[PDB]
Structures are given as structure tokens and as C-alpha cells.
């Protein structure tokens, strides 16, 4: 006599090839549906009625151009449930209305919650501190700010990113032309965290691999390591001296080193999420007012900042009619901004 | 400015070496956070509740400062056992190789678009039964590229093609 | 008063000073342009 | 250039207040008994 809850807990936490856990009850269906929804949509489903776009292998797109695209702007921020008032239970119409986008976004969100819960659950069962879960808060902040908060601030899900390779590239250029997102210091901190994280990844791996102790006779040195060994496999002292003499400073504390490798990319992604939350409201770092006052009064004053705004104005005018079809933009040839000859 | 003009003139976003570059820096950041979090997760208790755990490691000590078997036991259960590194030399070679190769390809992207072998062009690749173009997201990218093209260096071109 | 037993000394080592000053100065170098606008 | 007149005081205090906080903590760590 144990009690069904404890008996279920036993079975959920059995040491098996794929750990399940309580968290798996949330994780596995939502991850599978998000992934399955994306594969289904990119293989078979159009974007003709929401965007005027082909978007599936069935229509002739390739891996770079397929997408599961956002619903039409006229849907607003509708949850677009299969049984909701828009599709009314019709699976085919639901697909044509963009229901697979909210299907993927929402199962994806709950799947990410399930995964972070899995990180906590496994850490607790194995007895390690849950820093991997904490580091994962950065992917979650990015997904939530970009795929949920940003469209929720705009007119509709239509302006969220569509789930596709080229669709995402379009999202990047939209953010340049409309938000001047490269000028945003929260994006800049994000860039620093990503490139700084990649730098730390490379330099730490390279440093370990080139300060190894000779622990075997092979010219291939991977075999000379034992997971249960007590000794460091590389020389922290020699690594510290090398970088001190090359670069001026070096790590001396292995624990700080590895925390810093987490801190840098995690903090960078968190900062980029904050900037996108601002962009949800069009609270852009779009301009420098002093630059605009000077340039408006002085037609000989030019900087790279004013040069990039001209590019943005080109992006907006030339991409908006096809990119925002619900607006029914007709821009006669004569109003399109353009330089000489081109 | 360099980046935006480059996109109009080479469609670098649609070039697979820039894609490998992005995988390099996204993946490098991911693996940095992963490696950092797994080692931090399994530090051996060597400090009191007051002091920073960083004092639990002394510069130049001979013994490892974390339990790599504990770290592997967590990560092998997070995904599956054989997806996890138990060999620290293999692990750190991978940490070196992934961003380095990714950035090699990024650099080769710029260095070969330097000779105008440009990103994939699927402009008007999808056509209906009559012959009407059915736009894809690639065509929306092209509209942004054109907007950059016509505006950049607005007084510098006298002839219809920007050939360099 | 009788002494409070929950007090603890606080520490900031030199490396942490250098890291913190670097963070602050670089954040200031980054954000100052937007403050002047 | 017609910059915002509060940009100078904003930047100065942004630098000074947290830098001073760290200097206070560092110096009083050094002065503790070794």
C-alpha cells in the first residue's frame, strides 16, 4: 500500500533511455506538436490567403523559403483555436487562416516551459545545482519577447516572425527599415553577449586543448583522459601565464571562468529581449534628435547615421506594398524614394 | 551601413556560408552557456554559506573542482546518455571547433561574395499554371534589397547597373 | 544594544573592482550618446 | 550640436554613483584585518 501518486512518481522517474518525469507530461506533447506543426505546415500548407505567398514544399518552395506564416492582420491577436469562432472546427480553413502559426507558437511556449521544468527536475534527482535551467531563461526571454510580446504590442500576430528561414531574414530587414533596430543599445548588448559568448567558447576550448598534460603516448591525445580521474587534464598555471603575457590578463579561477561563460551570453540575450519589448510599442532607438536638427538646417552635414536612415526609407517604401498587403498600398512610381540612375 | 549595403548587393542572408557563420556564433554562445552552466552546476562543496563559491577553487590546485561524472549524469539524462560528453578533451575540442569553423565559413562568405558569387536567388522561382509569379518570402526579401539598392550612395551612380 | 548576531562582513576583491568599473564605464560609453540624443 | 541638456548630468551620475559604490566596497575590504 503506497498510494497511486507515489507509484506514478516511481514510474515517471525510472532511469530509462529517455527520461520522462512529471515535466515530460507537459514537455513531450507540446514539443512534438510544435515540431510536428512546423514540419506539417512547411511541407503542405500555403500562405496565399494570409500573405499572398507560397510557403510549402507542395507549392514549390525549398528548405530556405518554406515557412509557417503568421495569420492575416485582420485576425488581430486571435488565439485562432481550431474550435474558435474564426475556423469553427474546420481544419482546412484553420490552416488557410494561419491557425498553425498560433498552434506552433503556443505549444512551443508551453514546450519551452516543459523543458526548463525538465532541467529543474533532472538536476534535483541527480543532485546538482540547477544552473542549466537558469541559463535557459535567456532562450525563454527571447522567444517570449519576440514571438509573443512583440506582436501583442503591434496590430496583430501578422507582424510576429513567421516560422521559416527566409521569413526570419525578412523579419531582420523589417526591423532594420522600420525600427532601426541596429541603433538600439539593447540590441548592441545582445550582439556583445552572443559574439562574446562565441569568443569565450572558442578561446576556452582552444586553451584547454593546447595546455593539456601529456597523460599518454598517443599522438592523438583524446584517449589520455579518464572521467573518474581526480587531476585536471590541462595546466591552469601554464594557461594563466600564457594569456597574462599575450593579452595582459588571464583567468586564475576555474569556477569564475565557467560562471562567466554562462553570464555573458545569458545576459546578452536578456538585454536583447528588453529592446524588443520596447519595439512592441514602437519605442525605438530610431533617431538622434541633435543629428536631425543639424542635418535639417545644414545640407552639407552628413554622417553614417543619416546615410542609414536613407536606406531605411528605401526599405519601407519598396517592401511595404507586398509585405503589408492588408494595407492595399499603391505607391505610384513617382513617389518611390531612390537615388540617381538606380 | 556596410552590412545593409552588403545585403542589397550580395543577398548575404541567403548565402550558406553566412548561415554557417550564424550557427557558429549562435552555437558558440549556446555551448558557452551550456558548458558554463554544467560545470557550475556540479562544483564540489568547498565553501561555507557566506563566501562566494569561487573561493572553493585555489589557483594551481591539482584536483578537479567539479564532479564531471555528476555533470555527465545530468546532461545525459537531459537529452540522452550518448549525446553527452564524458571525455573532457573531446568536449573542449568541440567548444574550440564549432565557433572557429563557423567563423571560418563566415569569413569565406565575405571573401567569396567579394568576387560576386552571391547568396541564393529564388526571386520569382515559384510560378503558377498560367505563368504568374507566386511570391515567396524570398521575394519579400528582394523588395527590401531593392529599397536599399536604389537609396544607397544616392548621388554616386549615373548608369543603370551597380556593377561594383 | 546587545549585538545582532546576523551581521556579516562584506567584500569586494580587486578583480571584482576592475570588472565592475569596466562594466560601468562601458555601459556609460554605450548609453551616453542616447542620453545626449 | 543641440544635445539634451540633461545628458551631461545623466552620464556623470550614471558613471559616478555605481563606480563610487564599488570603490567604497573595495577599499573597506583592503582595510580589513588580514
Amino acid at each position: 500500500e503506497r498510494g497511486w501518486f507515489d507509484i506514478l512518481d516511481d514510474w515517471l522517474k525510472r532511469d530509462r533511455f529517455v527520461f520522462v518525469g512529471w515535466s515530460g507530461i507537459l514537455l513531450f506533447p507540446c514539443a512534438y506538436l510544435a515540431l510536428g506543426g512546423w514540419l506539417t505546415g512547411t511541407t503542405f500548407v500555403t500562405s496565399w490567403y494570409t500573405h499572398g505567398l507560397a510557403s510549402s514544399y507542395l507549392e514549390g518552395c525549398n528548405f530556405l523559403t518554406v515557412a509557417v506564416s503568421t495569420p492575416a492582420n485582420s485576425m488581430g491577436h486571435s488565439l485562432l483555436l481550431l474550435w474558435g469562432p474564426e475556423a469553427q472546427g474546420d481544419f482546412t480553413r484553420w490552416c488557410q487562416l494561419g491557425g498553425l502559426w498560433t498552434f506552433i507558437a503556443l505549444h512551443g511556449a508551453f514546450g519551452l516551459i516543459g523543458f526548463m521544468l525538465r532541467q529543474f527536475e533532472i538536476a534535483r534527482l541527480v543532485g546538482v545545482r540547477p544552473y542549466n535551467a537558469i541559463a535557459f531563461s535567456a532562450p525563454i526571454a527571447v522567444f517570449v519577447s519576440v514571438f509573443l510580446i512583440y506582436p501583442l504590442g503591434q496590430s496583430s500576430w501578422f507582424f510576429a516572425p513567421s516560422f521559416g528561414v527566409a521569413a526570419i531574414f525578412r523579419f531582420l530587414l523589417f526591423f532594420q527599415g522600420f525600427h532601426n533596430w541596429t541603433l538600439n543599445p539593447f540590441h548592441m548588448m545582445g550582439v556583445a553577449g552572443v559574439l562574446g559568448g562565441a569568443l569565450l567558447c572558442a578561446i576556452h576550448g582552444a586553451t584547454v586543448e593546447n595546455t593539456l598534460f601529456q597523460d599518454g603516448e598517443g599522438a592523438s591525445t583524446f584517449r589520455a583522459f579518464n572521467p573518474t580521474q581526480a587531476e585536471e587534464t590541462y595546466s591552469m598555471v601554464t594557461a594563466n601565464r600564457f594569456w597574462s603575457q599575450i593579452f595582459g590578463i588571464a583567468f586564475s579561477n576555474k569556477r569564475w571562468l565557467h560562471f562567466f561563460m554562462l553570464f555573458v551570453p545569458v545576459t546578452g540575450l536578456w538585454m536583447s529581449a528588453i529592446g524588443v519589448v520596447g519595439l512592441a510599442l514602437n519605442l525605438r532607438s530610431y533617431d538622434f534628435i541633435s543629428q536631425e536638427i543639424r542635418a535639417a538646417e545644414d545640407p552639407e552635414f552628413e554622417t553614417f547615421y543619416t546615410k542609414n536612415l536613407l536606406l531605411n526609407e528605401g526599405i519601407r517604401a519598396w517592401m511595404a506594398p507586398q509585405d503589408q498587403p492588408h494595407e492595399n498600398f499603391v505607391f505610384p512610381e513617382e513617389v518611390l524614394p531612390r537615388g540617381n540612375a538606380l | 551601413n556596410f552590412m545593409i549595403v552588403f545585403q542589397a548587393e550580395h543577398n548575404i542572408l541567403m548565402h550558406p556560408f553566412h548561415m554557417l557563420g550564424v550557427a557558429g556564433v549562435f552555437g558558440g554562445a549556446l555551448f558557452a552557456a551550456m558548458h558554463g552552466s554544467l560545470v557550475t552546476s556540479s562544483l564540489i562543496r568547498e565553501t561555507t554559506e557566506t563566501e562566494s563559491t569561487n573561493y572553493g577553487y585555489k589557483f594551481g590546485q591539482e584536483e578537479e573542482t567539479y564532479n564531471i561524472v555528476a555533470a555527465h549524469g545530468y546532461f545525459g539524462r537531459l537529452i540522452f546518455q550518448y549525446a553527452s560528453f564524458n571525455n573532457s578533451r573531446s568536449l573542449h575540442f568541440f567548444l574550440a571547433a564549432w565557433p572557429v569553423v563557423g567563423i571560418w565559413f563566415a569569413a569565406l562568405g565575405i571573401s567569396t561574395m567579394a568576387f560576386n558569387l552571391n547568396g541564393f536567388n529564388f526571386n520569382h522561382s515559384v510560378v503558377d499554371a498560367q505563368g504568374n509569379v507566386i511570391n515567396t518570402w524570398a521575394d519579400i526579401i528582394n523588395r527590401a534589397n531593392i529599397g536599399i539598392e536604389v537609396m544607397h550612395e544616392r548621388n554616386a551612380h549615373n548608369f543603370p547597373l551597380d556593377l561594383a | 544594544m546587545e549585538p545582532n548576531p546576523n551581521r556579516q562582513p562584506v567584500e569586494l576583491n580587486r578583480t571584482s573592482l576592475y570588472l565592475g568599473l569596466l562594466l560601468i564605464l562601458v555601459l556609460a560609453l554605450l548609453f551616453s550618446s542616447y542620453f545626449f540624443n | 550640436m543641440e544635445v539634451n541638456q540633461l545628458g551631461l548630468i545623466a552620464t556623470a551620475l550614471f558613471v559616478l554613483v555605481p563606480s563610487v559604490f564599488l570603490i567604497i566596497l573595495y577599499v573597506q575590504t583592503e582595510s580589513q584585518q588580514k
Binding site: V237, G248, S252 | - | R14, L25, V26, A28 | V3, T11
Partner: peptide, 30 residues
């Protein structure tokens, strides 16, 4: 005044580099 501010912060950073390298906490084996 804005140029002075930018150059001042930059100069403080370069000074910090100097102290961080030549007046670091010496790494010590124990």
C-alpha cells in the same frame, strides 16, 4: 561638452586597462 564626455569615459577605460594589467592581484599558487 558631449565630446569631452565621450573622450573622458574612453580615457578612464584606457587607464583601467593599465591598472588591470600592471596592478592586478598577482596569481599565486597555494
Amino acid at each position: 561638452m558631449e565630446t569631452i564626455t565621450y573622450v573622458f569615459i574612453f580615457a578612464c577605460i584606457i587607464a583601467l586597462f593599465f591598472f588591470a594589467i600592471f596592478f592586478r592581484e598577482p596569481p599565486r599558487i597555494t
